[PDB]
Design a protein around this ligand. Structure first.
Ligand SMILES: [Zn+2]
Ligand SMILES: [Zn+2]
Ligand SMILES: [Zn+2]
Ligand SMILES: [Zn+2]
Ligand SMILES: [Zn+2]
Ligand SMILES: [Zn+2]
Ligand SMILES: [Zn+2]
Ligand SMILES: [Zn+2]
Ligand SMILES: [Zn+2]
Ligand SMILES: [Zn+2]
Ligand SMILES: [Zn+2]
Ligand SMILES: [Zn+2]
Ligand SMILES: [Zn+2]
Ligand SMILES: [Zn+2]
Ligand SMILES: [Zn+2]
Lengths: 269, 270, 268, 268, 270
């Protein structure tokens, strides 16, 4: 809907053109210089803001990359260290796959019930849904699988530890994503910028008309487009787990993770 | 902040009525020098705000680590010692006490009620007697893990896995303390703030020659932009400070407590 | 560089601006420099921040590849220090580590890894690796099998097994990092906004300059265009670090360095 | 603040500009604001990036010192948790850890650590530490020996020995980091460039403003100068973090805090 | 710094602008300040980012070298703490660690490491190291063999071997980090764009300023030129942190410091 404010800006320019006649007869003067000062200041602030928004997006993408890496290596360790424990391989993989989908639902604020039931027995589904953090309970359940292998003497404390480390890595991902989801960049940044950029763009033609006359709408819309484009891009990057164009394709990412883990456990889709 | 905008409107009205006597004295104010001054100030505000934002982000990262480390420690205790519930409860109590005590320390509020709610009075007295109560809580959590080791319930290896988590917490405590004693700039920030203020108040006098009656509208818009950006950096620089929003810190301490009670079967109701 | 075309086009736009400046008043068009200074400075600021992001992405790609060389060197060092007599195991693992590098290279370039793999590995494993949808990952799994067997045979203890397992983790992070950089680009809306904005700005500029500069319009306009276009195109080249373009990573040379290193450390 | 001298000098330059503005035309000399806006903006940008480097360096220094407290707190926690009955060992190790902090402070301040060391350690150990060309590093060695003896006596296993040795490693990173910051400044050519341009800019400024401002020249010229100088001086204050001045790190108080923490945790 | 030539050259361009400003109309040349303010500000922004990127490479390079000192100190400390009586092993390992630093320096400076190697190690080892296409890597391998042999002889357990092995890994990361900075420069089109652009801008500048500044043209033009040229050449110097220029790393002094540390008092420890 950025196109709406561009069209609206064209209308404000036309108002600026038709009312420029009555400018002197009202006592209003508007030069370009003060608006260059204001405009450059806003651009500087948009530049820094946009940079921060991009960094949050990059970090979110990084965290999701770590899910894939840590889950691959955990399965790799299980196969290298306990090549014959295939039942354990399957149970742990189902938890690792459930973890990814559940993380996705947590970040999207959606119901993980259907995905959980496709992957896990109903008793486990109930236990997981009852927790205030189902992704955390899933890590705990995956941990019990490894813990029981340890108690049975199949894993030593050392080899248990190598795998426990991967669960710590997933916990770090969970916390990182939760931090990015609960933290926006402070609201007062968009509040300043969104209101400020819009007000600036609509007032601009009134300041340009004295110099540009009929050429006001073209130059005004070009300037507005530049500022609005840069501003709206930051808003989209600030919410990496959202549904908007340039947000993370979390569903495709979860599919990739699941396909990887079924590839390493001899299963076919 | 709304007050200085009103003050800026007041300065504009003064600028408008007094612009008359300007020539008969020889005083001039053009836009170009204030354009120079304004852009330089905007540049400095950008860099300043960048540093402030960096401090805000680190504060959230440190707090994110409390939640991560405490979750995994409790996970390890269940996976490695599933039957040691007395130990689970005592350790959970210390970890929860650690979070609340850390919050109170950074906010300079009294941690007594949270401590008495969570721990036996003997320990509360010991903790309150220390000049570093949050560190003492980590020490007490360490004793719990250490006792399990002497009892032969943890090996040196599995002890080590849990000890690492207490280390993550010590790093959080030190990092927050460093962030609290901060700021880095030696209150040269006060200068920078005043500079923005003087600029906003002198501005209508520099614009009035060009803008005339339209001066207060344009002058207040520009002031609003600079003052807002300045106050945002001020808020970001002091994430644990005197005039800060307590909702996330409170939400985090509540979140970790709810998680750990969930992980130890203390929730739901039987 | 096809920038020379857009500069020549800019020279043409300037001459048009010069000859048509006559009809400016008779059309009602006024163009001053001040609004374009505002727009130009805004574009420069956004280009600066964008170029910064492109550079960092290029730098990360570079770092990831540096890690391949480091991790593979130390894994081989550990094998020699810990199991100096196990040369059969050395040779097998080295072939897997070298194959990992080439396979990663081919994957990022979207080229066929077959000859490099057949040169390094027996055909039996090659078919197995190529049968997977994630061949580079399958190679790490196979390298892991070698180390796991040394452990089961009692040649490695759990501790020394762990020391080497850590290096395989370091390689897994590299694989994930590179894949992330390959699938996730700097968002395409950075390019669209900036390319449209920079090009339109450069072509409209002489029409705004002509009133002040007159005949001097094309020289000053092309200089400004060149400055913006050069900086913009630099970001384009940095944004695709795994590509074939001259200012891209010398991945072929890097893989050769890695292979020469690992055969140097094994008397090969 | 000796910034006031440069402001007073700036007031004088403004007065000269006002009274000498008459002979401006009779010489053919003009100074407009526009070129000084360009120059001023460029200088502001470079001052920004520079202060950014000065700031990061000061922050790192504070970070390094923060780590001393964390690592020493945890080492003592480990000693209590793992060896609750070994109080003699607790005291000896604590005295080395406290000595390490004071010795680091003296090294960075280039002061004599002898009195602090004698307060903490037996004279034999003091002699041994001071005989070294790197006394703070030698203190880490001695702390490692205490831990090493516990390992040899069987009170620490290799695992628990390793847990504590890791903390000595963190301290080694602090020592090297501080030494690196002490010898490596923000490069001097940044300060030299900036110092030369900022001073010249502020003194030339009133001559460039007088044509526009007339009688208001000293007030606006001083405002602008104060703004650049305040920002420039901020770097000056951040650049010497290990010094004694009021805006430098309170290393003495920091060392006292470290010592009080460690004696709180050992019942002293 | 060859900036002094281009500054003097810029003064000449100003005098040309002053003497030819009358003839501007008779040639059809008009040049205002506004377009050059736009162009100059864009260049300053780009120079700012470029210099920031150059400084970061410098900082990383200094950090990698700091790690050599740290990792080598702790490796020697560990050897003294864990195997206090193995002085023959201490000496051999220290000589490899010292050779590693000097060999790294020569590799980055593209100089011959032969003399330094012969000074520190027996000739048999020198030939083995010189025979490798990567001598610094071969030195780490030899330092690793020493540790590996202590392990095989039962003097180190797998655990204590691992503690020392970690430090050799830390050194491998330094070697790789330095090679990455050395084999890859910032892209060569950074140097090309900016140098041509800054120079062309500075020489064209007086022709645009003279209409405003008249006789003051050479002074203001050279001032602006000095600011842009200095910032540009400093960035060029920092991008090559292993080079010989004055703002580059004192690698020789750093290697001497490392050598003096590890050989502090005839290698004698308590
Ligand atoms: Zn990992
Ligand atoms: Zn299986
Ligand atoms: Zn952790
Ligand atoms: Zn329990
Ligand atoms: Zn609950
Ligand atoms: Zn490594
Ligand atoms: Zn071999
Ligand atoms: Zn064989
Ligand atoms: Zn093929
Ligand atoms: Zn630590
Ligand atoms: Zn004690
Ligand atoms: Zn000082
Ligand atoms: Zn280290
Ligand atoms: Zn010795
Ligand atoms: Zn003249």
């Amino acid at each position: 809907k950025i196109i709406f404010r561009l069209l609206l800006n064209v209308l404000m320019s036309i108002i600026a053109i038709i009312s420029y006649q009555w400018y002197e007869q009202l006592g209003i003067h508007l030069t370009v210089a003060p608006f260059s000062l204001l405009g450059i200041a806003i651009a500087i602030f948009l530049g820094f803001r946009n940079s921060a928004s991009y960094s949050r997006f990059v970090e979110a993408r990084n965290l999701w990359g770590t899910v894939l890496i840590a889950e691959r290596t955990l399965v790799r360790q299980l196969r290298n260290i306990l090549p014959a424990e295939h039942d354990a391989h399957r149970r742990i993989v189902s938890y690792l796959v459930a973890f990814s989908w559940s993380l996705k639902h947590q970040l999207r604020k959606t119901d993980p019930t259907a995905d959980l039931r496709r992957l896990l027995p109903e008793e486990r589904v109930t236990e997981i849904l009852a927790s205030s953090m189902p992704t955390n309970r899933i890590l705990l359940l995956a941990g019990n699988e490894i813990g029981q292998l340890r108690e049975a003497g199949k894993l030593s404390d050392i080899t248990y530890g190598l795998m426990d480390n991967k669960l710590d890595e997933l916990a770090h991902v969970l916390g990182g994503c939760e931090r990015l989801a609960t933290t926006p960049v402070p609201f007062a940044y968009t509040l300043i910028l969104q209101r400020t950029v819009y007000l600036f763009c609509t007032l601009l033609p009134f300041a340009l008309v004295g110099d540009l006359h009929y050429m006001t709408p073209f130059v005004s819309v070009f300037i507005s487009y530049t500022f609005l484009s840069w501003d709206s891009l930051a808003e989209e990057l600030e919410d990496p787990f959202g549904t908007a164009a340039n947000d993370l394709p979390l569903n495709a990412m979860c599919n990739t993770i699941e396909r990887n883990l079924l590839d390493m456990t001899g299963q076919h889709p």
